[PDB]
Symmetry: D2
Subunit: 120 residues, 4 copies
């Protein structure tokens, strides 16, 4: 009733974009010659993809809504997008794919934070 439906739609779209960005980025870093130096990057992409996938699904459901569950899930997704954005940005100079993924992570972090702030 107080919720911004536009911010909810933005969050769901960003979670799906960011899940796929991080799945692709984990795979792209796996195929880099410097893969041995990219292991935290790959791991954080895998976590970010898993949490964005779950968050998109939870936020897509309105039946028997529980703000406590939604808030806790958005907080988890904000936290991992923040971590994975920082990590991919550290490899921005190595490969465009990590620069691009850092942008996706930062965009989804913002969409989660904006929705979270408005749930009270």
């Amino acid at each position: 009733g107080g919720v911004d439906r536009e911010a909810m739609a933005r969050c769901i779209e960003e979670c799906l974009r960011c899940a796929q960005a991080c799945t692709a980025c984990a795979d792209a870093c796996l195929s880099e010659p410097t893969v041995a130096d990219l292991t935290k990057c790959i791991r954080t992409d895998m976590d970010c993809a898993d949490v964005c996938t779950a968050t998109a699904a939870v936020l897509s459901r309105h039946t028997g809504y529980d703000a406590n569950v939604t808030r806790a899930v958005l907080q988890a997704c904000a936290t991992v997008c923040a971590a994975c954005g920082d990590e991919c940005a550290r490899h921005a100079g190595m490969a465009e794919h990590c620069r691009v993924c850092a942008e996706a992570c930062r965009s989804c972090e913002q969409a989660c934070q904006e929705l979270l702030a408005g749930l009270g």
Copy 2:
């Protein structure tokens, strides 16, 4: 090497759109007064979301590509999209959400079939 990269990108985009469409449609049918008549619809949406989520991830990875694995996953996703498209279309007259979801299912079925045809 012989793969259509545009058809691969289309498949990944369609899997993510269709996963979310089916998650939302399962939830929408859950909230319908005639929910007791929509149980196969809700179940098939849940399967369709899970298989589209897995397929988008598998198709997003190029490292150590295996055509056997990719083909079998695309066949599963084509099969569930076909079934879930048929089921949601049965409720096209009841609610816009199922017509919309039927369109997403049929679109992703086609993207899986088009990519499958080109993998040999």
Copy 3:
């Protein structure tokens, strides 16, 4: 280095048991004659399954560990297991499957809370 490996293993096992319990319980309530009265139960089972699945995967990964990410994900999983345990317990008198699922939710809530408390 400070982490309880036994509590970490318990959490991962409980997340996988609880994900499957809630997937089965969503489906079992969908097939109940009183399904119209079980819609919050089914929705909360779907969220609980999605978050337990993500949490099991995040907690299974040690490379480039980040306690902020792990803590936020465990908090989300504790919160949804608590909600889904409460909801399934409300239908304990209707069907053994919901009683059983309530027990699984409460067991995973405890395993998440116990691990969370020890991460500092």
Copy 4:
């Protein structure tokens, strides 16, 4: 109606064990000094985890059962478990984690094949 409920339960248990085994094995190979030689292994573990997760969910649902969907999902899971078992077995001598994971993959491949054989 004709289905072996014991073989269905075995398949679901094996999918969840195998999903987690492959998630842990991807992470373990990520942390190996020879990670550059383990890239196909890590990728195949990621696919195997995603498909086992989806298969466990689909097989956990009985409402509006569709043998075509179930068969195609079990075929995908048998195919990726076979591929991931072969890949992890190649590193059986390098690390216990891959021998363990190879065993999980082979066990889940068998449970999928045994259930598939009985669905007609």
